Amino acid sequence: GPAVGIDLGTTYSCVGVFQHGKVEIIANDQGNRTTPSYVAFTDTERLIGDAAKNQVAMNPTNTVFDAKRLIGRRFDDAVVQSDMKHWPFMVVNDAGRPKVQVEYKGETKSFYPEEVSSMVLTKMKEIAEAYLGKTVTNAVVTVPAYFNDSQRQATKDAGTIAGLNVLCIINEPTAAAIAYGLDKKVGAERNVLIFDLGGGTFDVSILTIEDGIFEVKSTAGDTHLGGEDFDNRMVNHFIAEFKRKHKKDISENKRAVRRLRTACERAKRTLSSSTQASIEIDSLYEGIDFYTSITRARFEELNADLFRGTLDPVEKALRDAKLDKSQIHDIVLVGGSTRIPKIQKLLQDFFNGKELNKSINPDEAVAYGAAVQAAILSGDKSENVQD
Protein backbone atom coordinates (compact mmCIF):
# COMPACT_ATOMS: atom_id res chain seq x y z
CA GLY A 1 0.00 0.00 0.00
CA PRO A 2 1.29 3.45 -1.09
CA ALA A 3 2.63 6.39 0.86
CA VAL A 4 0.71 9.67 0.48
CA GLY A 5 1.69 13.35 0.24
CA ILE A 6 -0.13 15.78 2.55
CA ASP A 7 -0.17 19.57 2.27
CA LEU A 8 -1.17 20.62 5.82
CA GLY A 9 -2.18 24.18 5.00
CA THR A 10 -2.99 27.23 7.09
CA THR A 11 -6.56 27.38 5.70
CA TYR A 12 -6.95 24.24 3.54
CA SER A 13 -5.30 20.82 3.37
CA CYS A 14 -4.89 18.49 0.38
CA VAL A 15 -3.78 14.85 -0.06
CA GLY A 16 -2.34 13.13 -3.13
CA VAL A 17 -1.05 9.66 -3.98
CA PHE A 18 1.25 8.49 -6.76
CA GLN A 19 -0.20 5.20 -8.03
CA HIS A 20 -0.18 3.48 -11.45
CA GLY A 21 2.25 6.06 -12.82
CA LYS A 22 0.14 9.16 -12.09
CA VAL A 23 -0.55 11.46 -9.14
CA GLU A 24 -4.18 11.49 -8.02
CA ILE A 25 -5.26 14.46 -5.92
CA ILE A 26 -7.89 12.81 -3.78
CA ALA A 27 -11.42 14.17 -3.45
CA ASN A 28 -13.08 13.96 -0.02
CA ASP A 29 -16.58 12.48 0.46
CA GLN A 30 -18.15 15.88 -0.29
CA GLY A 31 -16.40 15.98 -3.68
CA ASN A 32 -13.73 18.55 -2.73
CA ARG A 33 -10.08 18.12 -3.69
CA THR A 34 -9.12 20.44 -0.80
CA THR A 35 -10.43 20.26 2.77
CA PRO A 36 -10.68 23.19 5.31
CA SER A 37 -8.09 22.99 8.12
CA TYR A 38 -10.98 23.41 10.60
CA VAL A 39 -11.97 21.43 13.66
CA ALA A 40 -15.32 21.99 15.44
CA PHE A 41 -16.38 20.73 18.83
CA THR A 42 -20.09 20.42 19.61
CA ASP A 43 -22.55 18.94 22.18
CA THR A 44 -22.34 15.53 20.45
CA GLU A 45 -19.44 15.36 17.97
CA ARG A 46 -16.05 16.45 16.70
CA LEU A 47 -16.36 17.71 13.09
CA ILE A 48 -13.41 18.11 10.70
CA GLY A 49 -13.06 19.87 7.32
CA ASP A 50 -16.10 20.87 5.31
CA ALA A 51 -18.65 20.06 8.03
CA ALA A 52 -16.58 22.05 10.56
CA LYS A 53 -16.21 25.15 8.38
CA ASN A 54 -19.85 24.92 7.32
CA GLN A 55 -21.20 25.43 10.90
CA VAL A 56 -18.74 28.21 11.96
CA ALA A 57 -21.52 30.85 12.10
CA MET A 58 -23.55 28.79 14.63
CA ASN A 59 -20.61 27.71 16.82
CA PRO A 60 -17.79 30.28 16.49
CA THR A 61 -16.07 29.90 19.88
CA ASN A 62 -15.65 26.12 19.60
CA THR A 63 -14.51 26.06 15.97
CA VAL A 64 -10.71 26.05 15.72
CA PHE A 65 -8.67 27.10 12.66
CA ASP A 66 -5.21 28.69 12.22
CA ALA A 67 -3.53 25.95 14.37
CA LYS A 68 -0.54 26.25 11.98
CA ARG A 69 0.07 29.77 13.35
CA LEU A 70 0.59 28.29 16.85
CA ILE A 71 2.44 25.10 16.00
CA GLY A 72 5.99 24.84 17.46
CA ARG A 73 5.72 28.19 19.27
CA ARG A 74 5.84 29.33 22.91
CA PHE A 75 2.85 31.08 24.47
CA ASP A 76 4.97 34.19 25.20
CA ASP A 77 6.09 34.46 21.56
CA ALA A 78 5.33 37.87 20.05
CA VAL A 79 3.58 36.18 17.06
CA VAL A 80 1.19 34.24 19.34
CA GLN A 81 0.33 37.25 21.50
CA SER A 82 -0.45 39.27 18.36
CA ASP A 83 -2.46 36.57 16.54
CA MET A 84 -4.65 35.77 19.55
CA LYS A 85 -6.64 39.00 19.06
CA HIS A 86 -8.12 37.82 15.75
CA TRP A 87 -9.41 34.43 16.96
CA PRO A 88 -12.91 33.82 18.44
CA PHE A 89 -11.59 30.73 20.26
CA MET A 90 -9.61 30.78 23.52
CA VAL A 91 -5.81 30.31 23.69
CA VAL A 92 -4.31 29.56 27.11
CA ASN A 93 -0.81 29.05 28.58
CA ASP A 94 0.20 25.60 29.84
CA ALA A 95 3.71 25.73 31.40
CA GLY A 96 4.89 28.04 28.59
CA ARG A 97 3.10 26.15 25.78
CA PRO A 98 0.01 27.48 23.98
CA LYS A 99 -3.24 25.46 24.09
CA VAL A 100 -6.62 26.03 22.44
CA GLN A 101 -9.46 25.77 24.92
CA VAL A 102 -12.92 24.67 23.79
CA GLU A 103 -16.25 23.37 25.04
CA TYR A 104 -16.78 19.80 23.92
CA LYS A 105 -19.75 17.61 24.95
CA GLY A 106 -20.56 20.00 27.79
CA GLU A 107 -16.94 19.86 28.99
CA THR A 108 -14.03 22.31 28.95
CA LYS A 109 -11.19 20.79 26.93
CA SER A 110 -7.82 22.11 25.75
CA PHE A 111 -5.52 20.83 22.96
CA TYR A 112 -1.92 21.57 21.93
CA PRO A 113 -1.48 23.01 18.38
CA GLU A 114 0.00 19.67 17.23
CA GLU A 115 -3.07 17.87 18.62
CA VAL A 116 -5.46 20.08 16.58
CA SER A 117 -3.28 19.63 13.48
CA SER A 118 -3.28 15.84 14.09
CA MET A 119 -7.12 15.96 13.72
CA VAL A 120 -6.73 17.63 10.29
CA LEU A 121 -4.08 15.03 9.33
CA THR A 122 -6.36 12.22 10.53
CA LYS A 123 -9.10 13.51 8.20
CA MET A 124 -6.68 13.67 5.26
CA LYS A 125 -5.51 10.10 6.09
CA GLU A 126 -9.16 8.96 6.06
CA ILE A 127 -9.77 10.75 2.71
CA ALA A 128 -6.85 8.78 1.19
CA GLU A 129 -7.97 5.48 2.83
CA ALA A 130 -11.51 5.85 1.36
CA TYR A 131 -9.98 6.23 -2.11
CA LEU A 132 -7.37 3.47 -1.76
CA GLY A 133 -9.57 0.98 0.09
CA LYS A 134 -6.66 0.26 2.42
CA THR A 135 -4.94 1.77 5.44
CA VAL A 136 -2.46 4.59 5.01
CA THR A 137 0.48 4.85 7.39
CA ASN A 138 3.40 6.46 5.56
CA ALA A 139 3.33 10.11 4.47
CA VAL A 140 5.40 13.09 3.35
CA VAL A 141 4.07 16.27 5.02
CA THR A 142 4.96 19.78 3.79
CA VAL A 143 5.74 23.03 5.70
CA PRO A 144 6.68 26.63 4.83
CA ALA A 145 10.32 27.14 3.83
CA TYR A 146 10.82 29.57 6.73
CA PHE A 147 9.66 27.03 9.41
CA ASN A 148 12.30 26.38 12.09
CA ASP A 149 13.25 23.05 13.78
CA SER A 150 10.65 23.56 16.54
CA GLN A 151 7.84 24.05 14.01
CA ARG A 152 9.07 21.14 11.86
CA GLN A 153 9.28 18.75 14.85
CA ALA A 154 5.79 19.85 16.06
CA THR A 155 4.41 19.13 12.57
CA LYS A 156 6.03 15.67 12.60
CA ASP A 157 4.53 15.09 16.05
CA ALA A 158 1.08 15.99 14.63
CA GLY A 159 1.63 13.23 12.08
CA THR A 160 2.59 10.70 14.77
CA ILE A 161 -0.54 11.58 16.77
CA ALA A 162 -2.61 11.01 13.59
CA GLY A 163 -1.12 7.46 13.45
CA LEU A 164 1.19 8.34 10.54
CA ASN A 165 4.85 7.54 9.99
CA VAL A 166 6.31 10.75 8.56
CA LEU A 167 8.88 9.78 5.95
CA CYS A 168 10.06 13.39 5.63
CA ILE A 169 9.07 17.00 6.27
CA ILE A 170 9.74 18.97 3.07
CA ASN A 171 9.26 22.63 2.05
CA GLU A 172 6.08 23.84 0.32
CA PRO A 173 7.86 25.72 -2.52
CA THR A 174 10.22 22.75 -3.07
CA ALA A 175 7.20 20.39 -3.24
CA ALA A 176 5.65 22.60 -5.99
CA ALA A 177 8.92 22.50 -8.00
CA ILE A 178 8.98 18.67 -7.64
CA ALA A 179 5.35 18.56 -8.94
CA TYR A 180 6.52 20.19 -12.17
CA GLY A 181 9.54 17.85 -12.46
CA LEU A 182 11.93 20.81 -12.20
CA ASP A 183 14.43 18.75 -10.17
CA LYS A 184 14.72 16.26 -13.09
CA LYS A 185 16.62 18.73 -15.26
CA VAL A 186 20.39 18.40 -15.81
CA GLY A 187 23.30 20.74 -16.65
CA ALA A 188 23.63 24.43 -15.68
CA GLU A 189 21.83 25.47 -12.49
CA ARG A 190 18.32 26.97 -12.89
CA ASN A 191 16.55 29.66 -10.81
CA VAL A 192 12.91 29.04 -9.91
CA LEU A 193 10.47 31.54 -8.35
CA ILE A 194 7.44 30.25 -6.43
CA PHE A 195 4.58 32.73 -6.09
CA ASP A 196 2.24 31.29 -3.46
CA LEU A 197 -0.88 33.24 -2.54
CA GLY A 198 -3.13 31.15 -0.32
CA GLY A 199 -6.02 31.68 2.04
CA GLY A 200 -4.09 33.35 4.88
CA THR A 201 -0.45 33.79 3.81
CA PHE A 202 1.58 35.00 0.83
CA ASP A 203 4.97 33.37 0.22
CA VAL A 204 7.58 34.17 -2.40
CA SER A 205 10.54 31.76 -2.59
CA ILE A 206 13.52 31.67 -4.96
CA LEU A 207 15.04 28.22 -5.41
CA THR A 208 18.19 27.28 -7.25
CA ILE A 209 18.12 23.72 -8.58
CA GLU A 210 21.15 21.86 -9.96
CA ASP A 211 21.26 18.11 -10.59
CA GLY A 212 18.13 17.66 -8.44
CA ILE A 213 19.69 19.46 -5.45
CA PHE A 214 17.69 22.37 -4.04
CA GLU A 215 18.85 25.56 -2.41
CA VAL A 216 16.44 28.08 -0.96
CA LYS A 217 18.13 31.34 -1.95
CA SER A 218 15.61 33.84 -0.54
CA THR A 219 12.12 34.04 0.96
CA ALA A 220 9.69 36.96 1.16
CA GLY A 221 5.99 37.64 1.59
CA ASP A 222 3.37 38.48 4.19
CA THR A 223 2.12 35.97 6.79
CA HIS A 224 -1.13 38.01 7.07
CA LEU A 225 -2.19 38.42 3.44
CA GLY A 226 -4.38 35.91 1.62
CA GLY A 227 -7.81 35.09 0.20
CA GLU A 228 -9.53 35.84 3.52
CA ASP A 229 -8.53 39.48 3.07
CA PHE A 230 -10.13 39.62 -0.39
CA ASP A 231 -13.31 38.10 1.10
CA ASN A 232 -13.29 40.82 3.78
CA ARG A 233 -13.12 43.62 1.20
CA MET A 234 -16.27 42.17 -0.38
CA VAL A 235 -17.95 41.78 3.03
CA ASN A 236 -17.56 45.48 3.90
CA HIS A 237 -18.90 46.42 0.44
CA PHE A 238 -22.11 44.41 1.02
CA ILE A 239 -22.56 45.64 4.64
CA ALA A 240 -22.76 49.16 3.17
CA GLU A 241 -25.22 47.97 0.49
CA PHE A 242 -27.49 46.30 3.07
CA LYS A 243 -27.50 49.36 5.36
CA ARG A 244 -28.50 51.63 2.44
CA LYS A 245 -31.21 49.32 1.07
CA HIS A 246 -32.76 48.36 4.41
CA LYS A 247 -31.89 51.01 7.09
CA LYS A 248 -30.30 48.17 9.16
CA ASP A 249 -26.67 47.64 10.24
CA ILE A 250 -25.53 43.99 10.31
CA SER A 251 -21.93 44.80 11.43
CA GLU A 252 -22.46 43.84 15.08
CA ASN A 253 -24.39 40.65 14.35
CA LYS A 254 -21.53 38.14 14.23
CA ARG A 255 -23.62 35.34 12.67
CA ALA A 256 -24.89 37.58 9.82
CA VAL A 257 -21.34 38.82 9.06
CA ARG A 258 -19.99 35.22 8.92
CA ARG A 259 -22.91 34.07 6.77
CA LEU A 260 -22.19 36.98 4.40
CA ARG A 261 -18.46 36.19 4.29
CA THR A 262 -19.21 32.58 3.23
CA ALA A 263 -21.33 33.88 0.36
CA CYS A 264 -18.55 36.33 -0.67
CA GLU A 265 -15.88 33.60 -0.81
CA ARG A 266 -18.13 31.55 -3.14
CA ALA A 267 -18.75 34.57 -5.43
CA LYS A 268 -15.02 35.32 -5.52
CA ARG A 269 -14.26 31.80 -6.78
CA THR A 270 -16.92 32.19 -9.50
CA LEU A 271 -15.28 35.49 -10.53
CA SER A 272 -12.05 33.65 -11.47
CA SER A 273 -13.87 32.05 -14.42
CA SER A 274 -16.91 34.36 -14.96
CA THR A 275 -17.12 38.18 -15.13
CA GLN A 276 -20.04 38.43 -12.68
CA ALA A 277 -21.39 36.53 -9.67
CA SER A 278 -24.73 36.52 -7.84
CA ILE A 279 -25.32 36.26 -4.08
CA GLU A 280 -28.47 34.83 -2.45
CA ILE A 281 -28.86 34.65 1.37
CA ASP A 282 -32.11 33.59 3.10
CA SER A 283 -33.00 35.77 6.12
CA LEU A 284 -29.55 37.35 6.53
CA TYR A 285 -30.63 39.80 9.22
CA GLU A 286 -33.95 40.37 11.04
CA GLY A 287 -36.04 38.42 8.50
CA ILE A 288 -34.56 40.16 5.44
CA ASP A 289 -33.40 38.10 2.45
CA PHE A 290 -30.23 39.47 0.78
CA TYR A 291 -29.91 39.22 -2.99
CA THR A 292 -27.26 40.98 -5.06
CA SER A 293 -24.67 40.82 -7.85
CA ILE A 294 -20.99 41.76 -8.22
CA THR A 295 -18.73 42.10 -11.29
CA ARG A 296 -15.12 40.95 -11.72
CA ALA A 297 -14.27 44.63 -12.30
CA ARG A 298 -15.79 45.67 -8.95
CA PHE A 299 -14.05 42.82 -7.08
CA GLU A 300 -10.66 43.82 -8.56
CA GLU A 301 -11.25 47.46 -7.60
CA LEU A 302 -12.16 46.57 -4.00
CA ASN A 303 -8.80 44.73 -3.74
CA ALA A 304 -6.64 46.93 -6.02
CA ASP A 305 -4.02 47.88 -3.40
CA LEU A 306 -3.67 44.34 -1.99
CA PHE A 307 -3.21 42.84 -5.51
CA ARG A 308 -0.50 45.22 -6.81
CA GLY A 309 1.22 45.03 -3.39
CA THR A 310 2.07 41.35 -4.04
CA LEU A 311 4.84 42.55 -6.39
CA ASP A 312 6.91 44.13 -3.59
CA PRO A 313 7.85 40.81 -1.93
CA VAL A 314 8.74 39.58 -5.45
CA GLU A 315 11.21 42.49 -5.82
CA LYS A 316 12.55 41.90 -2.29
CA ALA A 317 13.08 38.17 -2.93
CA LEU A 318 14.92 38.95 -6.19
CA ARG A 319 17.37 41.37 -4.58
CA ASP A 320 18.03 39.07 -1.59
CA ALA A 321 18.79 36.26 -4.05
CA LYS A 322 21.00 38.76 -5.95
CA LEU A 323 19.17 38.07 -9.21
CA ASP A 324 17.63 40.21 -11.93
CA LYS A 325 14.10 39.31 -13.11
CA SER A 326 15.58 38.35 -16.48
CA GLN A 327 17.62 35.69 -14.64
CA ILE A 328 14.56 33.56 -13.47
CA HIS A 329 14.06 30.28 -15.44
CA ASP A 330 10.64 29.13 -14.22
CA ILE A 331 7.79 30.89 -12.38
CA VAL A 332 5.33 28.66 -10.51
CA LEU A 333 1.83 29.65 -9.33
CA VAL A 334 0.84 28.02 -6.04
CA GLY A 335 -2.10 28.68 -3.76
CA GLY A 336 -5.84 29.00 -4.40
CA SER A 337 -5.69 32.80 -4.76
CA THR A 338 -3.35 32.62 -7.79
CA ARG A 339 -6.41 31.48 -9.75
CA ILE A 340 -7.44 35.20 -9.73
CA PRO A 341 -6.94 36.48 -13.34
CA LYS A 342 -5.83 39.96 -12.16
CA ILE A 343 -3.11 38.39 -9.98
CA GLN A 344 -1.87 36.32 -12.93
CA LYS A 345 -1.82 39.40 -15.20
CA LEU A 346 0.07 41.50 -12.63
CA LEU A 347 2.80 38.84 -12.22
CA GLN A 348 3.22 38.09 -15.93
CA ASP A 349 3.44 41.82 -16.77
CA PHE A 350 6.12 42.15 -14.07
CA PHE A 351 8.11 39.40 -15.81
CA ASN A 352 7.59 41.10 -19.21
CA GLY A 353 5.14 38.56 -20.66
CA LYS A 354 6.98 35.36 -19.59
CA GLU A 355 4.77 32.26 -19.33
CA LEU A 356 3.61 31.13 -15.88
CA ASN A 357 3.62 27.51 -14.69
CA LYS A 358 -0.05 26.93 -13.82
CA SER A 359 -1.09 23.68 -15.56
CA ILE A 360 -1.28 21.96 -12.16
CA ASN A 361 -4.16 23.36 -10.07
CA PRO A 362 -2.25 25.87 -7.90
CA ASP A 363 -4.10 24.82 -4.70
CA GLU A 364 -3.08 21.20 -5.41
CA ALA A 365 0.60 21.69 -6.47
CA VAL A 366 2.12 21.27 -3.00
CA ALA A 367 0.23 18.01 -2.30
CA TYR A 368 1.13 16.84 -5.84
CA GLY A 369 4.89 17.23 -5.20
CA ALA A 370 4.60 15.70 -1.74
CA ALA A 371 2.95 12.65 -3.35
CA VAL A 372 5.78 12.24 -5.86
CA GLN A 373 8.32 12.57 -3.07
CA ALA A 374 6.49 10.09 -0.84
CA ALA A 375 6.61 7.45 -3.62
CA ILE A 376 10.37 8.06 -4.14
CA LEU A 377 11.14 7.71 -0.43
CA SER A 378 9.08 4.50 -0.27
CA GLY A 379 10.93 2.75 -3.12
CA ASP A 380 7.81 3.09 -5.33
CA LYS A 381 9.24 5.39 -8.02
CA SER A 382 12.46 3.78 -9.34
CA GLU A 383 14.33 4.70 -12.59
CA ASN A 384 15.01 8.14 -14.21
CA VAL A 385 17.25 9.12 -11.24
CA GLN A 386 15.56 10.34 -8.04
CA ASP A 387 13.51 13.13 -9.64
Binding site: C168, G212, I213, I376, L377, G379, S382, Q386
Partner: protein
Protein backbone atom coordinates in the same frame (compact mmCIF):
# COMPACT_ATOMS: atom_id res chain seq x y z
CA UNK B 1 33.40 13.66 -9.90
CA UNK B 2 35.50 10.88 -8.26
CA UNK B 3 32.92 10.14 -5.52
CA UNK B 4 30.17 9.77 -8.13
CA UNK B 5 32.39 7.57 -10.34
CA UNK B 6 33.23 5.39 -7.31
CA UNK B 7 29.51 4.76 -6.71
CA UNK B 8 28.75 4.11 -10.39
CA UNK B 9 31.51 1.45 -10.52
CA UNK B 10 30.30 -0.13 -7.26
CA UNK B 11 26.75 -0.30 -8.65
CA UNK B 12 27.83 -1.87 -11.97
CA UNK B 13 30.21 -4.39 -10.37
CA UNK B 14 27.78 -5.83 -7.79
CA UNK B 15 25.13 -6.80 -10.39
CA UNK B 16 22.19 -5.82 -8.10
CA UNK B 17 23.21 -8.61 -5.73
CA UNK B 18 21.88 -7.17 -2.47
CA UNK B 19 24.38 -9.11 -0.31
CA UNK B 20 27.32 -7.98 -2.50
CA UNK B 21 26.15 -4.37 -2.15
CA UNK B 22 25.53 -4.45 1.63
CA UNK B 23 28.80 -6.28 2.35
CA UNK B 24 30.78 -3.54 0.56
CA UNK B 25 28.74 -0.37 1.23
CA UNK B 26 31.47 0.87 3.61
CA UNK B 27 33.78 1.38 0.59
CA UNK B 28 31.48 3.96 -1.06
CA UNK B 29 30.20 6.00 1.88
CA UNK B 30 31.38 9.60 2.21
CA UNK B 31 34.22 10.56 4.54
CA UNK B 32 32.57 11.68 7.78
CA UNK B 33 30.05 8.83 7.83
CA UNK B 34 30.48 7.24 11.26
CA UNK B 35 27.34 5.13 11.92
CA UNK B 36 27.80 2.24 9.48
CA UNK B 37 29.95 -0.71 10.55
CA UNK B 38 31.32 -2.93 7.76
CA UNK B 39 29.12 -6.04 7.49
CA UNK B 40 30.61 -9.42 6.58
CA UNK B 41 28.92 -12.11 4.48
CA UNK B 42 28.55 -14.31 7.60
CA UNK B 43 25.90 -11.84 8.80
CA UNK B 44 24.08 -11.94 5.45
CA UNK B 45 23.17 -15.63 4.97
CA UNK B 46 19.46 -15.85 5.79
CA UNK B 47 16.65 -13.72 4.36
CA UNK B 48 16.05 -12.40 7.93
CA UNK B 49 19.69 -11.24 8.13
CA UNK B 50 19.53 -9.55 4.72
CA UNK B 51 16.35 -7.66 5.70
CA UNK B 52 17.80 -6.44 9.03
CA UNK B 53 20.99 -5.19 7.35
CA UNK B 54 19.09 -3.62 4.42
CA UNK B 55 16.91 -1.66 6.84
CA UNK B 56 20.00 -0.36 8.68
CA UNK B 57 21.60 0.66 5.38
CA UNK B 58 18.64 2.67 4.04
CA UNK B 59 18.57 4.61 7.32
CA UNK B 60 22.23 5.64 6.78
CA UNK B 61 21.72 6.77 3.16
CA UNK B 62 18.14 8.06 3.54
CA UNK B 63 17.55 11.09 1.28
CA UNK B 64 15.50 12.92 3.96
CA UNK B 65 18.44 12.96 6.44
CA UNK B 66 20.86 13.68 3.60
CA UNK B 67 18.98 16.81 2.44
CA UNK B 68 21.34 19.80 2.30
CA UNK B 69 24.49 17.79 3.18
CA UNK B 70 27.61 17.78 0.95
CA UNK B 71 27.07 14.05 0.30
CA UNK B 72 23.38 14.35 -0.65
CA UNK B 73 23.81 13.25 -4.28
CA UNK B 74 25.76 10.13 -3.24
CA UNK B 75 23.32 9.09 -0.54
CA UNK B 76 20.53 9.32 -3.14
CA UNK B 77 22.45 7.11 -5.62
CA UNK B 78 23.13 4.45 -2.95
CA UNK B 79 19.55 4.55 -1.59
CA UNK B 80 18.04 3.98 -5.04
CA UNK B 81 20.35 1.10 -5.89
CA UNK B 82 19.66 -0.58 -2.52
CA UNK B 83 15.90 -0.30 -3.06
CA UNK B 84 16.20 -1.86 -6.52
CA UNK B 85 18.37 -4.66 -5.11
CA UNK B 86 15.89 -5.28 -2.32
CA UNK B 87 12.95 -5.49 -4.75
CA UNK B 88 14.89 -7.95 -6.91
CA UNK B 89 15.74 -9.99 -3.77
CA UNK B 90 12.03 -10.08 -2.82
CA UNK B 91 11.11 -11.33 -6.34
CA UNK B 92 13.27 -14.47 -5.97
Amino acid sequence: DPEKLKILEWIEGKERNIRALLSTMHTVLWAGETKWKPVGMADLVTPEQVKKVYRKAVLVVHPCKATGQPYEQYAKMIFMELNDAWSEFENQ
